[PDB]
């Protein structure tokens, strides 16, 4: 039977908006017919509904703004696999690196002519707009402070001026990537998701489909000093989930919090005191910290590894990242006792 899921982190919930996921082989025409049936049956009960978006490409389904009262009815619709209430996510050369983040300063000296701004924009209203993304674009491909200087980047805006996005917005962004690729294929794709929300079944499934479709995904483990498995896309298995370490080989402390850890973390990378492009001026640099910065280093290492070995499967690329990582340098004593064995003591490194 069809199931209902809502974010366990109650303040991150976005009630009134639902991702209705249909069974794996549901056609687009069927997804539209199921949306219309929901609108029609909902209308009979005096409820007004809006279909905001219809999914096709990775995951069939639709985004509906409606009253939660209609969920039992919606769960009985044929082709329905599960429904998820929307929730918030937050900022944490032959290869194309996609960035799903805030707006970016594309003319910054550091990334000028290496980053292409797509027309994609899906952000919630607000409760410096480009600080988070610009710095990250710079960490991946910046002329002076970048990891993969020769990498070209395509950016999508899924985070607003406060670094706040939605799971629905992120799904649409991930679908935009798959669509662009089918319309105009190129070489290997690296998808950088320097964001995180609570555990999400739909977001993990979208990441899993993109991964099984041959696209490489790199994500932030999260800055909640918690187990990365309770956050998304961090928890998605086939994704490369990156924790943050500092110059002293210490897991990063971010105030009362810090880097996430556990079995869902694939490896760690530098994520404290990271110099990179400051969106304050065209030649401005600033130091930043977070699993976003750590993930950006891994997206750069992976871009260079895939450029050297373009035939690497997602699994072969994973084995190369582990094999080339520095072993057992991280202070395990910073992690909770039971997590020390579960957390891989790996610090990302380029092949020598």
């Amino acid at each position: 039977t069809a199931t209902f899921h809502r974010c366990a982190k109650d303040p991150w919930r976005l009630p009134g908006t639902y991702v209705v996921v249909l069974k794996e082989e549901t056609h687009l025409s069927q997804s539209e017919r199921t949306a219309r049936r929901l609108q029609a049956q909902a209308a009979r009960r005096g409820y007004l509904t809006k279909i905001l978006h219809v999914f096709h490409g990775l995951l069939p389904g639709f985004l509906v703004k409606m009253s939660g009262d209609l969920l039992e009815l919606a769960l009985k619709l044929p082709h329905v696999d599960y429904i998820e209430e929307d929730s918030s996510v937050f900022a944490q050369s032959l290869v194309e690196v996609y960035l799903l983040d805030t707006s970016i300063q594309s003319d910054h000296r550091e990334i000028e002519g290496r980053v292409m701004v797509t027309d994609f924009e899906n952000v919630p209203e607000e409760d410096k707009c480009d600080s988070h993304g610009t710095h990250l674009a710079g960490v991946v491909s910046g002329r002076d402070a970048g990891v993969a200087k020769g990498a070209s980047m395509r950016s999508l805006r899924v985070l607003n001026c406060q670094g706040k996005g939605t799971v629905s917005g992120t799904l649409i962004g991930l679908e935009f990537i798959r669509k662009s690729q089918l319309v105009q294929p190129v070489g290997p794709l690296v998808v950088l998701l320097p964001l995180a929300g609570g555990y999400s079944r739909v977001l993990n499934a979208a990441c899993q489909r993109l991964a099984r479709a041959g696209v490489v995904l790199v994500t932030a483990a999260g800055n909640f000093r918690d187990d990365a498995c309770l956050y998304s896309p961090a928890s998605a298995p086939e994704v490369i989930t990156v924790g943050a370490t500092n110059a002293q080989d210490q897991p990063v402390t971010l105030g009362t919090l810090g880097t996430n850890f556990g079995r869902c973390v694939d490896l760690f990378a530098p994520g404290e005191d990271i110099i990179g492009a400051s969106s304050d001026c065209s030649t401005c640099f600033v130091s930043q910290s977070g699993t976003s910065q750590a993930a950006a280093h891994v997206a750069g290492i992976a871009a260079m590894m895939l450029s050297a070995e373009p035939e690497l499967t997602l699994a072969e690329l994973r084995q190369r990242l582990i094999h080339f990582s520095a072993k057992d340098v991280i202070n395990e004593a910073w992690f909770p006792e039971d997590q020390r064995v579960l957390t891989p003591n790996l610090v990302a490194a380029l092949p020598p």
């Binding site: 990891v147 990378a269 005191d273 110099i275 401005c284 640099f285 130091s287």
Partner: peptide
């Protein structure tokens, strides 16, 4: 501390992180 040029950051401090990942 926001620096208005690369040289200004270099004088203030070869970033540790690019060294750590073996890029240098």
């Amino acid at each position: 501390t926001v620096f208005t040029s690369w040289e200004e950051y270099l004088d203030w401090v070869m970033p540790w992180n690019l060294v750590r990942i073996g890029l240098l």
